Amino acid sequence: MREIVHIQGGQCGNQIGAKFWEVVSDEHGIDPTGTYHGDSDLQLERINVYFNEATGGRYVPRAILMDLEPGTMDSVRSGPYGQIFRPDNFVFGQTGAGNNWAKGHYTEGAELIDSVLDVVRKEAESCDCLQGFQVCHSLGGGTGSGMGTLLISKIREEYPDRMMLTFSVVPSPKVSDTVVEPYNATLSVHQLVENADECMVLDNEALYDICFRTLKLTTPTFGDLNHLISAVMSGITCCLRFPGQLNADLRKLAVNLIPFPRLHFFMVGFTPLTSRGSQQYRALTVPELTQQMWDAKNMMCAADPRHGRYLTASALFRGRMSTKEVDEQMLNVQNKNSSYFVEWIPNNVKSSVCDIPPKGLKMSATFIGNSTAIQEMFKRVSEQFTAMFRRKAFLHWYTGEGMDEMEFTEAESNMNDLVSEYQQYQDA
């Protein structure tokens, strides 16, 4: 019951998809062999949300790795946890993608959709009652941004009732990991405004400072940033996989979050986060977690809460704690700094809780907030897009794949119609 299915499309998706399944595999006490080696029966109770019982008592994931140029898959096929995947759940094409939205969405994408859909349905029926999908993106690239949305446009039409989350990694504000980041952003965002129920936005910039300032790390490898992304993605299903004195399923999280069908761009964080030294200084109490989670640093996205107004918010605590504390805390926050919140919503937070913390900790939290400062990223990018599209730089690459110019202006206007949605509801 409440089965999920996980998609990993792209180089980022295939890589953070590794660390993700590395965390959950530990959380349920299973070894890279695929066998269970935990202690409690509680591990095996809701394991079927992410895995599939096999012969001889194995548990293999239900992920789908799809990517052109299987190079980066040859890595995860050779990592420590590379033995758990079904080799059949690997979709790859012998051609490069070129960091180009077009061929990842029109030419090369269309040659693999026959396989990917034949793959997703092999397990969308292995679920007794499917809860919803869950993907990982890289909006700058061509595989994750072309095949990603192309698959979504297919997912939305055969399974509209179900829910699809999206941990999309957005372009950075200051540095640009790609020169054609704008075109790949808008053309994808336009796809996400119509075919997405929820969509977190994570930026590689904020992940660095959090790994620099708060975590005091010296050399933050991408293996470390994904120990963060994995932490929050695991923090959403704790109500699904584990008991809780106030559970909160995946659906009741959106209903309670997006007031309008378009404003599904959220902002996340994780607590606690301390260096190896400061662990011995600061206590682990509910007022601590809520002090760091509401901060403007733990926001994995590069959007400042102190500029816009929180439409709604969330919090998923994990640990045997006192549910009075969480309720009075989240009330005080809205009470004191009562200008960051809109007024036509009396109480605009939800607060889950779970009897089960992570495997190494005793108390943890997890934050999701739907602010109006998210309009800033779509403003910063809608300026860079219209800057170079005005002179038609790098366009002979896109138009060479049967694209047009209406497929551009449509993408831009549909984004500008979204930036106004985030302005009306900002009454300062």
Ligand X SMILES: Nc1nc2c(ncn2[C@@H]2O[C@H](COP(=O)(O)OP(=O)(O)O)[C@@H](O)[C@H]2O)c(=O)[nH]1
Contact positions vs other proteins (CB under 8 A): 121, 125, 158
β-pairing, 312-318 vs 365-370, is antiparallel
Residue 16 interacts with ligand X (CB under 6 A)?
Answer: yes
Q: Which segment (7-15, 84-92, 119-127, 277-285) binds ligand X by CB under 6 A?
A: 7-15
- Has 143 been labeled as part of a binding site? yes
177's contact among ligand X, other proteins, none, with CB below 5 to 8 A by partner kind, is: ligand X
Q: Which segment (10-18, 74-82, 238-246, 337-345) binds ligand X by CB under 6 A?
A: 10-18
Could you tell me which residues are beta bridge partners of residue 136?
A: 167
Rounded Cα distance, 102 and 140, in Å: 12
Residue 365: burial class (beta carbons within 10 Å; 0-12, 13-18, 19+):
buried
Nearest CB to ligand X, comparing residues 141 and 357: 141
Neighbouring CB atoms inside 10 A of 77's CB total 14
- Has 334 been labeled as part of a binding site? no
Among 17, 34, 140, 357, binds ligand X (CB under 6 A): 140
Token pair in block for residue 189: 């965002």
- Has 325 been labeled as part of a binding site? no
Nearest CB to ligand X, comparing residues 14 and 329: 14
Are 36 and 59 in contact by the 8 Å Cβ rule? The answer is yes
H-run or E-run covering 406:
helix 406-424
Among 7, 47, 97, 250, binds ligand X (CB under 6 A): 97
Nearest CB to other proteins, comparing residues 1 and 175: 1
61's contact among other proteins, ligand X, none, with CB below 5 to 8 A by partner kind, is: none
- Contact partners, residue 192, CB within 8 Å, separation at least 6: 149, 152, 166, 168, 199
Neighbouring CB atoms inside 10 A of 274's CB total 16
Rounded Cα distance, 85 and 93, in Å: 18
- Has 223 been labeled as part of a binding site? no
Among 8, 43, 48, 99, binds ligand X (CB under 6 A): 99
140's contact among ligand X, other proteins, none, with CB below 5 to 8 A by partner kind, is: ligand X
Give the helix ranges, DSSP H, for 257-405: 286-293, 323-336, 375-389, 395-399
Size of the site for ligand X (CB under 6 A): 21
Token pair in block for residue 138: 């890289």
Among 177, 205, 327, 407, binds ligand X (CB under 6 A): 177
- Has 9 been labeled as part of a binding site? no
- Has 360 been labeled as part of a binding site? no
The helix/strand/coil state of 309 is coil
In the complex, minimum distance from the CB of residue 165 to ligand X, in angstroms, rounded to a whole number: 17
Scan residues 383-402 and list those touching ligand X (CB under 6 A).
none
Secondary structure of the chain: what % helix, strand, coil (to 5)? 40, 15, 40
12's contact among other proteins, ligand X, none, with CB below 5 to 8 A by partner kind, is: ligand X
Question: Where does the chain break, by residue before each gap (C–N > 2.5 Å)?
Answer: none
**In the block, residue with structure tokens 């599209």:** 389
Dmax of the chain from CA atoms?
A: 63
158's contact among ligand X, other proteins, none, with CB below 5 to 8 A by partner kind, is: other proteins
Rounded Cα distance, 43 and 49, in Å: 11
Among 8, 89, 134, 138, binds ligand X (CB under 6 A): 138
Degrees (nearest 5) of the Cα angle 106, 109, 115? 140
Q: Which segment (27-35, 126-134, 143-151, 310-318) binds ligand X by CB under 6 A?
A: 143-151
In the complex, minimum distance from the CB of residue 78 to ligand X, in angstroms, rounded to a whole number: 16
Are 315 and 267 in contact by the 8 Å Cβ rule? The answer is no
**CA distances from residue 135 to 4, 147, 162, 199, 379 in whole angstroms, order as listed:** 11, 12, 14, 10, 25
Nearest CB to other proteins, comparing residues 159 and 425: 159
Nearest CB to other proteins, comparing residues 121 and 392: 121
Nearest CB to ligand X, comparing residues 132 and 141: 141
- Has 142 been labeled as part of a binding site? yes
Q: Which segment (12-20, 120-128, 338-346, 420-428) binds ligand X by CB under 6 A?
A: 12-20
Are 89 and 65 in contact by the 8 Å Cβ rule? The answer is yes
Which residue number is nearest to ligand X in terms of Cβ?
141
Scan residues 196-235 and list those touching ligand X (CB under 6 A).
204, 222, 225-226, 229
Binding-site sequence positions for GTP: 11, 69, 138, 142-144, 204, 226
Question: Which residues line the annotated binding site for Mg(2+)?
Answer: 69
Query: Given the rule CB under 6 A, which residues bind ligand X?
Result: 10-12, 15-16, 97, 99, 138, 140-145, 169, 177, 204, 222, 225-226, 229
